Design a protein around this ligand. Structure first.
Ligand SMILES: *[C@@H]1O[C@H](CO[C@H]2O[C@@H](C)[C@@H](O)[C@@H](O)[C@@H]2O)[C@@H](O[C@@H]2O[C@H](CO)[C@@H](O)[C@H](O)[C@H]2NC(C)=O)[C@H](O)[C@H]1NC(C)=O
Ligand SMILES: *[C@@H]1O[C@H](CO[C@H]2O[C@@H](C)[C@@H](O)[C@@H](O)[C@@H]2O)[C@@H](O[C@@H]2O[C@H](CO)[C@@H](O)[C@H](O)[C@H]2NC(C)=O)[C@H](O)[C@H]1NC(C)=O
Ligand SMILES: *[C@@H]1O[C@H](CO)[C@@H](O[C@@H]2O[C@H](CO)[C@@H](O)[C@H](O)[C@H]2NC(C)=O)[C@H](O)[C@H]1NC(C)=O
Ligand SMILES: *[C@@H]1O[C@H](CO)[C@@H](O[C@@H]2O[C@H](CO)[C@@H](O)[C@H](O)[C@H]2NC(C)=O)[C@H](O)[C@H]1NC(C)=O
Ligand SMILES: *[C@@H]1O[C@H](CO)[C@@H](O)[C@H](O)[C@H]1NC(C)=O
Ligand SMILES: *[C@@H]1O[C@H](CO)[C@@H](O)[C@H](O)[C@H]1NC(C)=O
Ligand SMILES: *[C@@H]1O[C@H](CO)[C@@H](O)[C@H](O)[C@H]1NC(C)=O
Ligand SMILES: *[C@@H]1O[C@H](CO)[C@@H](O)[C@H](O)[C@H]1NC(C)=O
Ligand SMILES: *[C@@H]1O[C@H](CO)[C@@H](O)[C@H](O)[C@H]1NC(C)=O
Ligand SMILES: *[C@@H]1O[C@H](CO)[C@@H](O)[C@H](O)[C@H]1NC(C)=O
Ligand SMILES: *[C@@H]1O[C@H](CO)[C@@H](O)[C@H](O)[C@H]1NC(C)=O
Ligand SMILES: *[C@@H]1O[C@H](CO)[C@@H](O)[C@H](O)[C@H]1NC(C)=O
Ligand SMILES: [Cl-]
Ligand SMILES: [Cl-]
Ligand SMILES: [Cl-]
Ligand SMILES: [Cl-]
Ligand SMILES: [Cl-]
Ligand SMILES: [Cl-]
Lengths: 524, 524
């Protein structure tokens, strides 16, 4: 199967999925490899090619540090890259239904990883079930991460910031110019992503340059107002220079620093990324999005507040135990290998881990809010995960949804409360961050795979809802007497729960918690 | 002039006020003197008398400790009793217009003093200007204060609690049964009072036994939800027993303690009142209202919340610098005799004075709210007075008004922002607590007295507004092209400013401050 694109012909491969066929085009290039003098620059457009580009395997993942905290453990290793790392990593994948569609809705995935890690080639991001089952086209891209994607010296095109957001954007253009050839509709494109991928999706809603490259957005466990999502121009400067110090690249002509950094092996850059901040957390985003005057014209909070963003429908949601995952990456007394019953003093030390530069009154105020016991030995353990999830994911996603919907558009909010029967992390970690993804992608649809029956059905439903959102702007499942998903409005704040038993309509998720994070904490 | 009452004839005296005459009946009795075995009991009804009771001078003030902090100083001494102290103090005054009215509206004053001090015979409470100028009848009563009025051992009729609130109530009955004889309308009775007198007025709105003894209410700088206004049953017990300890009256048959206390000289009781709490503030109400199952059937906060109170119009208001007065009664670095520029560490020590049993996080949170400077040397001085006024008077009055109006009735809120030209306290103390009273009573109407012209006019207006509230339920001044006073509603929260220059309609008095006191602080 050979598709003609604007730049050249590309060959895919046939896949057998569920007694049907999907066609996959794995590793199509979308930019000049950002090597040599292109390191740190915005992605540059690709020269046409003769011959047939073979898109028959996933390409290189971008350079990145790996999670080595639990060698041999699937719970953590399933997130690590499964493809060679390389600076030559600007590739994308396309799964198309077979038979070839006429004007399919397009679903474009943006992975998370803190803006520091990630790749589109993970097993949990495999778009063939969606292409098979819903007859959508699924697209995914690799984009640069860490200092290579987000190093900033604002105004200086040598290292402008946001390069990895420009990678995403240039892939959205490729879909604009090329997807009709695969049988896709460029006028029906939905972006979806999780955590940093979800934050990215929210920034595309704000970037004027992304306005006409997509239709609708889905934000899983992430939004650009989360505390980890945007690097201040002050922090960025300090970090660009700390990285310079550490590689012998300190200069004074800022363009001589970059030039120096373009001579380091990618691996010496990775090495020194971790130390650019005196104290990091398990939630550190050393090099992330900045206000660059290009992708992002102003503090995104000001943009949200004042309604300067793409006017369209959004689907936003979070998982029940967002914060637990991060606890075993530094909180005293925590372990995946035991029940992690911790003491008040452990709790207090944990805050110091997750809130390193916070005043002592700031931290006491968290403790005060989260320890009015309602005792039970898991009290402190449970409270620290809630602290981390509410502050970092849940409260920002809920505030993002309120503020966006106040400008007129329909918004749908979910609370994902199902733990995988297959989860390799312990029970106390619950419904973890990242563990809705396999449901969205339709992994439990694969019978050979050891999910329960209830899981198959949960995933089938979510897939239908996501696909109806993409195609029609309405995440309903209309055929099987299912709970209607109400629009989220900032008065009532109705949201839908996603679980194997019963979907519920509920209101005002985490209302007391978010009043704290949203209205008081920004002050400390 | 001899009026026949239910109990006997009473003779008044003629007064020349403003080229007119008022008739005053000063010191009419309204209960058996609460002496001997009646000490600590609810007021008992008075036996009829022959002869003409001469009501030609103010009677005894009830026993009470005196403010000796500034001997020879008018600013403080003007609040001290001006009549012999005596346990024989259950008397009331009546000023009636001359010529004698046909069916005059009645204004009943209840003084403040923290429930510990006060008398109706103060110069600033003289009702003759009101009777002269508005042709209302003004009534005032002495009621027991301190342990003699509010000692509690709940359920035990020997010392039930709330005795001084029952004194007020029995005086409201006297007006019910007797005021028609003076030319008054028992069906048009408005209670007004300041601070503890205003808190008392708010408790009469809740007491079912007071429902039919009045029509409308005015609350100046006080309400029953202020932190000083209601003694917990736990604190009351501890205090009744501490007082017992201190007078050698410790027993075990609780009725033997009271009997013991009935043998102490009133002066040994006064002496030991101050020490019943280990740490007091300048705002201490050692012996105040309790939930007694009689006057007050349940925690008044629960009553307000659930709309169990008299359904009628209220006028409520506060002064601009409520808290300043209390600062020179114990806050380090403060003096009426200098500008009281204080340091951060002084501020911090001051909180310890005003919030003695508050956790250290509680106090840091006050500091945090009140010290986000917007530096200037009076910053800390100004912040401590605001802390004290917002917490103690302003925020509770505003919350009382919100909650009352949510049940349907019209409510009018004022912010009094005029400093007397005659104020003997320094400039930095501003528009003090207590210093609207002379305006309400029409003192600046007396030309001989050295108030400015603007003050005369301010008082004339307030008097008209108060009298129209009493007579008609609407505090308007309709004749002189004056600002209309809008109803207070919990959505808009409109209030009227009272000053010599310009009355303004404004909204949401102290909105950030009260969110703090009202929604966060109750937690610490
Ligand atoms: C901006 O960065 C400086 C630099 O400090 C860092 O130097 C890097 C090369 C790296 O190895 C890092 O771990 C190291 O801390 C920060 O100032 C330093 O802060 C830490 C603790 O406060 C100390 O170790 C240093 O004594 C101190 N040195 C200097 C030069 O000031 C600084 O914290 C940071 N500023 C921001 C934006 O937080
Ligand atoms: C209830 O009262 C007790 C009694 O303490 C007081 O005794 C009084 C007669 C009086 O002189 C007063 O100043 C004195 O404090 C309180 O317990 C006492 O608390 C203070 C300080 O906490 C100490 O001086 C005493 O050691 C202590 N003694 C006892 C017997 O416990 C107590 O504070 C109080 N409880 C309440 C309701 O606050
Ligand atoms: C769970 O596992 C962790 C790590 O093995 C335990 O934490 C250690 O235990 C004690 C103090 O509690 C010390 O030996 C170490 O200082 C701890 N290490 C860390 C990083 O916390 C924890 O005790 C275990 N808890 C259980 C079984 O409840
Ligand atoms: C205002 O007057 C008070 C009391 O006279 C002063 O406070 C005293 O001054 C110093 C410390 O500041 C010490 O001598 C005493 O410990 C203080 N007494 C108290 C009760 O605070 C204050 O300094 C004066 N402030 C001025 C002129 O600004
Ligand atoms: C691309 O793949 C096909 C496999 O059938 C092959 O015919 C062609 O020569 C390939 N080109 C290469 C190896 O780059
Ligand atoms: C696909 O659908 C769009 C409307 O969403 C339409 O404008 C376009 O012409 C269609 N293209 C096809 C069927 O080739
Ligand atoms: C810094 O160096 C660059 C050459 O890479 C040059 O273009 C620029 O003018 C220099 N900036 C100054 C004026 O220091
Ligand atoms: C609804 O149920 C039917 C039959 O029970 C089945 O074909 C389908 O999988 C279900 N649809 C969705 C989208 O949940
Ligand atoms: C009451 O006062 C009048 C004063 O004119 C007097 O005639 C009468 O005897 C008085 N009774 C007393 C002194 O108690
Ligand atoms: C006074 O007015 C009331 C109505 O407010 C009325 O019921 C009463 O009869 C009047 N009494 C008089 C004029 O004596
Ligand atoms: C306490 O003493 C009183 C007498 O004053 C008596 O009425 C009461 O029964 C006694 N209470 C008891 C049972 O201890
Ligand atoms: C209104 O002004 C008139 C004349 O200027 C005067 O008689 C009266 O004192 C004023 N009325 C009030 C109640 O303020
Ligand atoms: Cl939950
Ligand atoms: Cl600190
Ligand atoms: Cl359902
Ligand atoms: Cl003000
Ligand atoms: Cl404490
Ligand atoms: Cl006016």
């Amino acid at each position: 199967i050979i598709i003609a694109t604007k730049n050249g012909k590309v060959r895919g491969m046939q896949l057998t999925v569920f007694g049907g066929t999907v066609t996959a085009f794995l590793g199509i290039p979308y930019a000049q490899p950002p090597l040599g003098r292109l390191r740190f620059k915005k992605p540059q457009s690709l020269t046409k090619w003769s011959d047939i580009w073979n898109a028959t395997k996933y390409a290189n993942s971008c350079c990145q540090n790996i999670d080595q905290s639990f060698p041999g453990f699937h719970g953590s290793e399933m997130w690590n890259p499964n493809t060679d790392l390389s600076e030559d990593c600007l590739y994308l994948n396309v799964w198309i239904p077979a038979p070839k569609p006429k004007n399919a809705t397009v679903l474009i995935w943006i992975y998370g990883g803190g803006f520091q890690t990630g790749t589109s080639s993970l097993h949990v991001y495999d778009g063939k079930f969606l292409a098979r089952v819903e007859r959508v086209i699924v697209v995914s891209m690799n984009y640069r991460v860490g200092a290579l994607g987000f190093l900033a010296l604002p105004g200086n095109p040598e290292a402008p910031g946001n390069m990895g957001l420009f990678d995403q954007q240039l892939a959205l253009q490729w879909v604009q110019k090329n997807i009709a050839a695969f049988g896709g509709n460029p006028k029906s494109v939905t972006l979806f992503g999780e955590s940093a991928g979800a934050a990215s999706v929210s920034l595309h809603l704000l970037s004027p340059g992304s306005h006409s490259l997509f239709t609708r957005a889905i934000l899983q466990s992430g939004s650009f107002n989360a505390p980890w999502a945007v690097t201040s121009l002050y922090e960025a400067r300090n970090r660009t220079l700390n990285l310079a110090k550490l590689t012998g690249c300190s200069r004074e002509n800022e363009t001589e620093i970059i030039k120096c950094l373009r001579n380091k092996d990618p691996q010496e850059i990775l090495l020194n990324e971790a130390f650019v901040v005196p104290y990091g957390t398990p939630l550190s985003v050393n090099f992330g999005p900045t206000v660059d005057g290009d992708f992002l014209t102003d503090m995104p909070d000001i943009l949200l507040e004042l309604g300067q963003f793409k006017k369209t429908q959004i689907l936003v949601g979070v998982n029940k135990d967002e914060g637990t995952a991060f606890l075993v990456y530094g909180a005293p007394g925590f372990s995946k290998d035991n029940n992690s019953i911790i003491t008040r003093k452990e709790f207090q030390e944990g805050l110091k881990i997750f809130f390193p530069g916070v005043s002592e009154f700031g931290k006491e105020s968290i403790l005060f809010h989260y320890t009015d016991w309602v005792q039970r030995p898991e009290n402190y353990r449970e409270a620290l995960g809630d602290v981390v999830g509410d502050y970092n994911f849940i409260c920002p996603a809920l505030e993002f949804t309120k503020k966006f919907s106040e400008w007129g558009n329909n918004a749908f909010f979910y609370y994902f409360e199902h733990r995988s029967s297959k989860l390799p992390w312990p029970e106390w970690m619950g419904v973890m961050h990242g563990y809705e993804i396999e449901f969205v992608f339709g992994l439990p649809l694969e019978r050979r795979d050891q999910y329960t029956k209830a899981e198959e059905i949960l995933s089938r439903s979510i897939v239908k809802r996501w696909a109806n959102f993409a195609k029609y702007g309405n995440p309903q499942e209309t055929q099987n007497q299912s709970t209607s998903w109400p629009v989220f409005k900032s008065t009532e704040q109705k949201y839908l729960t996603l679980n194997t038993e019963s979907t519920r309509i509920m209101t005002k998720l985490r209302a007391q918690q978010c009043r704290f994070w949203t209205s008081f904490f920004p002050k400390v």
